[PDB]
Amino acid sequence: DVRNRIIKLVKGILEQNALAADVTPQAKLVDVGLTSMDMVNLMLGVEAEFDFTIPQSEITPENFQSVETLERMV
């Protein structure tokens, strides 16, 4: 699970911006504190880190609910 540990890192880095909190796999990203621009920046972070491009069809609340559902997409 190299993906999971890396996802939590980029999420924790974006949250490292006038804020700080906990982050678990079953925890919802919106609950964590991510706003619209954060979700945008998080999607770009994920696409840049794992050298891939997410299909438009895969950009859904389901896939981007939690770290778990996110890693399950990659």
Partner: peptide, 9 residues
């Protein structure tokens, strides 16, 4: 993606 965040929020 903005739409996703919007629905989520």
């Amino acid at each position: 993606m903005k739409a996703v965040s919007q629905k989520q929020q």
